[PDB]
Design a binder for this molecule. Structure first.
Ligand SMILES: O=C1c2ccc(S(=O)(=O)O)cc2C(=O)c2ccc(S(=O)(=O)O)cc21
Ligand SMILES: O=C1c2ccc(S(=O)(=O)O)cc2C(=O)c2ccc(S(=O)(=O)O)cc21
Ligand SMILES: O=C1c2ccc(S(=O)(=O)O)cc2C(=O)c2ccc(S(=O)(=O)O)cc21
Ligand SMILES: O=C1c2ccc(S(=O)(=O)O)cc2C(=O)c2ccc(S(=O)(=O)O)cc21
Ligand SMILES: [Mg+2]
Ligand SMILES: [Mg+2]
Ligand SMILES: [Mg+2]
Ligand SMILES: [Mg+2]
Lengths: 468, 468, 468, 468
């Protein structure tokens, strides 16, 4: 009973649209929208969406195994050793947002300042003192993107596990010899860095040229959460403003997935005519290339919706009923929807390209979807007085072992790599970017349905130490 | 009665080093050290210092007029119109940390997300609606450093006022014609951008080639706060660890200033032999070139202390009693003092080059000195129930004019450009970087003297919305 | 009767290895090696080869049609209009080395200084005065590689013709409207630049992912010149030094092509055992990535010759009998063959990546293969007294129309875009790079067979004006 | 009897403007204009000039000692050892155009392909075999500008000698220890690279901030060649076209120098009113910043000619009688003089910034002034049958020691570093750029006076090997 089970449970009940019962629904935390900076929904004019892991939520672990298997295969297919084929995806290992150190082949879970919180090498969890040999100040320069990778998104889950599998594998294959920075095999030396590259290449490959999409769209129920309430909310959004899709995915794939998400024997609400997915949007934009989308963008194109091929040249015309865009930029959406940024709420799951960049570069309002938040919330309250015990032991410091021990037992409930948002008392870089960049966040955007359209989402004013 | 008056008042009383009276001293807020992230002083091994506006605090407005006058002069000297000479520095105008928009020649005071809080053009304070013509989403892309300048440090005070003077001047000189982006004068067009460049050039000029230093060191009492307690604290620091100076200033100037700061008829405490300033440091480094200092650095050199000229070539020897370094990097200091970063507390006033970069790039502990914090703290409590009234009006929103009105009356107490750390209920980008990068901060580092050496500076653990 | 006909004619006669008959063979110009800077063959220790259009010479126009057809198809396949399919490759149009101006969609044939010699738009040959509207100083900045493309190699022949086809097509399709910089079609605007990109993408596509290789290797006799003398020369080279292959092509393709080039019922000379192509080389290197190969290179890999896949990691071992390399750099070849540069003769057809860069970056000796030189040499002597007449009319200038007229009649004999090496009296950029970078050059490297191994290739010493 | 003696000899005779006597004057080689590519003077519309070492030719060795002395002094002044003061400039050492290798501290004289022709370390002339330890292929990558410097211009003469002085000095001072790449002195290591930087800094310093200009303009007759014929030629140029000055020098200095060049008790010809230097130009542009001038340029400014200070802002007006420009670009000159490039003849002495870049980037016609060409031409004919003997010994190679010997005796006549344009039979990189970029060249532009205005300067058409 993972987190996509929770979402497909929530998904399976029709909304009681009675006002009283909505207020009580969104009392339970799995259904709350959480506020980081106040936001007056009255003033949002356009709602805009990402697709993958936002509107279309890939069932777990099923989808991650598929990615993993396909990547394992690709790699064996280009000459990595047969033993990889015997690997099998373990959803209890990877937590999202870890940084992969390509110098020493460690997975690292870090705070906002790049302080080490957990360091794993293969599957050996390197303890405090022993990490000082490689990180003498228990810290990593987060900005050194040549060395540190950071696996931010749920697509990175398979690779997160895979990297740990490969490191452990070679550490323990007597054919290879460990070195500080990689493995020797006679006359061939494979550094963790180039190893890591190979994994990245292979994951891209299964996405853009291999069989992930193809295997996905032929078993949508296996891999993709479907929720009656989705058409309802979008329809409700379009009643008070403008609704738009801007997604990195291409049109053809976007079409297969969205069709499915709307495939119900009715429209927004039981008993109404089914209308096609496109009718739910005032502007549809694909091949977005976020985060570049939030800067110079790319040349604006028109999609020929029959073929699914792009028309030839640069689209210079206006927003017409039926048109579909490819590329362009976030200004395209602004000009065309006659919106300036704080007018818009952009809803997506990518902490960097969907959230951080639209806020920083454009002044857009932000809603971050976090799937795991479903499971993480069961664990947070199931185990609440374990945490409250940790809060107590820190406060009594006015014995250190019992801290590090309790912390461990806590993190363990979450997975081998702990909560998404913290390691014991200390918050992760990911938690830290949620609070800082995501104005609102939830386990799923569908949680918006439970708030009235005029709702005022309200966060407490921050005070500086010297102001208290 | 400004803020350097407060510091020279505090400076003028000898420390009562009785333990009880120290605890009570640092109760009053002007003397508190404020904590943003917990820090156990027991574990700091090296204390390191900036000089300008840290150890040597330039008396205000005297020092700022001097800078301003010298810059005004330089500019008239390269052909700017005589009328500039009649300008005169106004300490009630500029607040530090404003961003100068070189496209439209506005001073802008912004929050962490680059939202407009105050916008001034020349001296005309552009109100809400009218700012939308130029900033249609009431926001600026903070990362667009080609366009936006940001005047971060107390050295920037003179230029902050100067830029407003120049814009207002030309707006109203009938010889020139206003344009969106600058001024026409017959066949010459001077954009705000190139205007701004000229000001920057001229300020650098008076610092590196003009008479600022020379006029300063010949009237140190006029321009530089001197405090008996300084030698005392450094001496106390050296008793429990290592003490180091790493400053952007060159040696000669560093020597004149530091000599003065130690010029008392005694040592660390009344009745003891006066020892020279260098004896207070285990490592002295000049020509630091921060923030580059916190990256690749520059080639490490040795200062010939007789001449004050650099020796020829790259210093490869060890830390020797008496040696003075030039350039190098922050690793130089780490290797040589046998320190890893969290061991160190670096104390300085530059929010970017001293604080943000040492934390981000090196994992160094940080103490930010903020002079204005002295005055800003009188105003914060003198006017406390005005603010508490603002907190009330926001909360009653569950009438808008009364918000914007009260906000105004509040900010006005601070200056024309308001508090350093906020504009009414909303925090500035500067406030936001203090909390995020500066582990400790105070009106002056001397506030450290009032805490025991084993003190545990303690900040409350952050919780995410969904965790509460 | 083109130029690959000439080579397959020369190819089809066995070498008379009698010394007297060799001296007389290489008297006729099609068989000469031409010298630009003296070179003592006695001192060359390693001969090194490119493959495509060097050792393996693609029959013309057959190969070019194939490329063209495949590219035309690709483009229609991504949405370019059906009419392209009716195009058909015209070998009498393109001359190699033209520059494509992506601003205005012209093919330009230029001298070393980028002076215009011929300018064609679609198929309209823009005359003198009319070119001044777009090139007011009859010149182009050759270094402006963002704007100017330059189609240098015989692979570029199909695209050279294709670009002219497309420009002419749209100029004259009433569905589109000409503009200075591209074509409007309702709301879509396709600039020549982006048009040009599409063509480039499509040519790469048929090479790396489409069916060019696949269609080629299944009809080698159709597409690839085979010459008994090739194994003979290589064998003769290996008798006096070291022989190496360093090619951009991957191993699999390199294997199919080279096998074929050596597919004869005998070895180097009629009656001897056939030996496999690899035995002819002391070092075999593929995936060369020239010209980067002549700088930092890429990571050195080993080819697993059974699979044709790369082994995993970086090859650190020595040169072993049987080994095949991938990537690396030109230093790899130097270290491993124990050669410094002037020791080596590198033989290839790419004026930039094979010749200019190895000379400039490494001090390697150079032999440039130029296929067209076969046909161009028939034309040069067939029409010799036309040229000698042009030389006369220039000299009598001490009437202008007769110059421009004779020039035309001359260039026409070569093709629509004239000789490779000149336009009337004036030399091309290509000619100019041959003389400057290619130490020796010939219609084919096989011309080396006709010179003794100790031969001294001898060019006249240059004198400066003031020295004569 | 150097080369500036020759020019001041030529300078001192008034021109016999009789047509017959002009034709005979320009028969003698010191007075010839040499042609690299034909040029019809009938078609030049604007003549444009550099100043330093073009119109104003600094007397040698006097000027070079001054530069050298001033640089030596600067360096001792920043801490280089006293012994430098005892150095003294030796005009028989440096030849222009040498490359300084900052890795190993060698002066290198190279051909166009960067082949070594002479290599000196300090003053030790490293012979053939011994150079192979450091340059194993007797070659340098010319494009590696991080390592190789190249001292191109007559201003570089002092530094050329200075670098050799310093290297020799430290090689032989027992206080220092030689290393491959620099010198150790206890704990200080000074690499040749950083040494070289120091020299460069110091030369810039004496030019922009030290006393070179100031000492120069107070003894113009000592340092600057003055020639009656100069006003005559410019006046003659202005009669048939447009005349312009575009110089890197600032206005004030440009004014002192040009005033002097025109300081005669008459105008263009004895007996006419003296007119001021500015009247000789249709466009005057200073602070040119060549070669950037030949690209994006800089912002166009107007000079206030009373003060010599720049007016404030960007000049947008038209070409007005009396106006003086600062910065801008080469398009400024083109637009304003209504010229496209081949219309213009630009006359200057900088092989890169004056000649190579205007030709390559703009299609401008070029005249290169080469002062040394005066002396080099005495030596070329004084010693003609020594060279003709070298030509003979090369040809008889169909004994090697006698080549290298004769070469030596030849080069020696020129200086320690040989002719500017060759080392024995082999041409320098400098010679090679003259022929390739400089359409015309002469010992001085005054040689133009001896050609009629309609003259056709005529170079022989180049033929490729295979065309002969
Ligand atoms: O450059 C980044 C990037 C840089 C730094 C971080 S972070 O330190 O975790 O905030 C995070 C990121 C990213 O998450 C990311 C995602 C996608 C791209 S893309 O290739 O331009 O599309 C670039 C990036
Ligand atoms: O590049 C910056 C800089 C960039 C961005 C900001 S900030 O947005 O206010 O944090 C702030 C800054 C700075 O405060 C600053 C201070 C000194 C230099 S220097 O010329 O490299 O020494 C660069 C900088
Ligand atoms: O950058 C160039 C290039 C630049 C300039 C010229 S040229 O002006 O004709 O000499 C010619 C060229 C080339 O011919 C060429 C061929 C292949 C590459 S690659 O993409 O790096 O492999 C780059 C280049
Ligand atoms: O970048 C160069 C440069 C590069 C290469 C050569 S060359 O190899 O001798 O042709 C020569 C040169 C130069 O002669 C030169 C002169 C002045 C400048 S400046 O600092 O931009 O003004 C740059 C340069
Ligand atoms: Mg997403
Ligand atoms: Mg400071
Ligand atoms: Mg080739
Ligand atoms: Mg010059």
């Amino acid at each position: 009973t993972s987190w996509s089970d929770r979402l497909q449970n929530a998904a399976d009940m029709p909304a009681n649209m009675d006002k009283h019962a909505l207020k009580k629904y969104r009392r339970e935390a799995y259904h709350r929208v959480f506020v980081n900076r106040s936001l007056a929904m009255e003033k949002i004019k356009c709602f805009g969406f990402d697709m993958d892991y936002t509107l279309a939520v890939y069932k777990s672990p099923e989808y991650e195994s598929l990615g993993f298997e396909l990547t394992v295969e690709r790699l064996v297919s280009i000459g990595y050793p047969q033993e990889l084929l015997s690997f099998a995806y373990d959803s209890t290992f990877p937590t999202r947002g870890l940084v992969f150190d390509t110098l020493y082949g460690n997975l690292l879970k870090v705070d906002a300042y790049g302080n080490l919180l957990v360091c794993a090498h293969g599957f050996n969890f390197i303890r405090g003192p022993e990490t000082r040999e490689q990180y003498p100040n228990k810290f990593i320069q987060r900005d050194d993107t040549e060395r540190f990778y950071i696996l931010n998104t749920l697509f990175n889950l398979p690779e997160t596990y895979l990297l740990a599998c490969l490191v452990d594998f070679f550490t323990n294959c007597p054919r290879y010899t460990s070195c500080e920075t990689g493995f020797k095999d006679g006359d061939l030396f494979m550094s963790y860095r180039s190893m890591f590259q190979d994994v990245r290449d292979a994951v891209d490959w299964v996405h853009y040229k291999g069989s992930l999409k193809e295997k996905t769209v032929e078993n949508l129920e296996k891999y993709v959460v479907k929720d009656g309430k989705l058409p309802l909310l979008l329809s409700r959004m379009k009643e008070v403003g403008k609704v738009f899709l801007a997604t990195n995915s291409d049109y053809k794939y976007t079409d297969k997935i969205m069709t499915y998400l709307f495939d119900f024997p009715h429209g927004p609400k039981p008993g109404s005519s089914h209308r096609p997915w496109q009718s739910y949007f005032d502007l549809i934009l694909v091949d977005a290339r976020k985060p570049l989308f939030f800067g110079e963008g790319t040349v604006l194109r028109q999609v020929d919706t029959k073929t699914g091929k792009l028309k030839i040249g640069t689209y210079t015309g206006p927003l017409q009923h039926g048109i579909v865009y490819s590329g362009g930029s976030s200004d395209t959406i602004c000009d065309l929807l006659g919106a300036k940024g704080k007018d818009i709420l952009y809803i997506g799951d990518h902490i960097f390209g969907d959230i951080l960049k639209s806020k920083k570069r454009q002044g857009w309002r932000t809603f971050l979807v976090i799937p795991e938040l479903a499971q993480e919330l069961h664990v947070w309250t199931d185990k609440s007085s374990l945490f409250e015990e940790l809060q107590s032991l820190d406060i009594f410091l006015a014995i250190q072992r019992r801290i590090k021990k309790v912390t461990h037992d806590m993190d363990m409930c979450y997975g081998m790599m702990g909560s998404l948002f913290r390691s014991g008392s200390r918050q992760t870089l990911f938690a830290s970017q949620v609070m800082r960049y995501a104005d609102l966040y939830a386990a799923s955007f569908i949680n918006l349905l439970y708030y009235p359209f005029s709702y005022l989402f309200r966060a407490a004013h921050v005070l500086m130490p010297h102001e208290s």
